Write a protein that binds this ligand. Structure first.
Ligand SMILES: Cc1c(Cl)ccc2c(/C=C3\NC(=O)N(Cc4ccc(F)c(F)c4)C3=O)c[nH]c12
Ligand SMILES: Cc1c(Cl)ccc2c(/C=C3\NC(=O)N(Cc4ccc(F)c(F)c4)C3=O)c[nH]c12
Lengths: 84, 85
């Protein structure tokens, strides 16, 4: 069930080492983790919350923060980057 | 920088999530622990700092069921038992 990240996103994934154009969600989210892990964008105290104003990622979601817990919306933000 | 020398145990593991050197810093090994814990999803969905290694090569090499990434000193203890240095 593969996909394609609008120019920006794709340069995001590829910052953390994708090399394709086509990804299942489950496969893409993996790469997001990379971006958030290598970039300590999670909060250290609230360890499920992510913190993005300042970051490229911030833009892509138009939030400056969010929590991975809630899927209902974590997808939204990602569609909004897929040529989907 | 200050490299450190890991046991035969550990090392296997790192090697599973990429790593190469038979020589690594602190900030280097927590890097791969980091990756392992991530890929083999071992933290808790609700409790994100808490990490269940019950069952897994990691826990059998930290000798524990679980543990908090909060306790700072405390992760250090465990880390050591896996260093021939
Ligand atoms: C939300 C979210 C996403 Cl999406 C992706 C990654 C994380 C995440 C990652 C880490 N938290 C942390 O403390 N470390 C350091 C670390 C490494 C090895 C250890 F063994 C260890 F105890 C501690 C991490 O790598 C915390 N929240 C996240
Ligand atoms: C302590 C610790 C260590 Cl050591 C290693 C990994 C983690 C970690 C990993 C994740 N937390 C999370 O919620 N996801 C799913 C996820 C991924 C990308 C997204 F963009 C996203 F919105 C949701 C994760 O992959 C959370 N704490 C950790």
């Amino acid at each position: 069930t593969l996909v394609r990240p609008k120019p920006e996103l794709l340069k995001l994934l590829k910052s953390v080492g994708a090399q394709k154009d086509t990804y299942t969600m489950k496969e893409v989210l993996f790469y997001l983790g990379q971006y958030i892990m290598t970039k300590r964008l999670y909060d250290e105290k609230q360890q499920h919350i992510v913190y993005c104003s300042n970051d490229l990622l911030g833009d892509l979601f138009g939030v400056p923060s969010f929590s991975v817990k809630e899927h209902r919306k974590i997808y939204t933000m990602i569609y909004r980057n897929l040529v989907v």
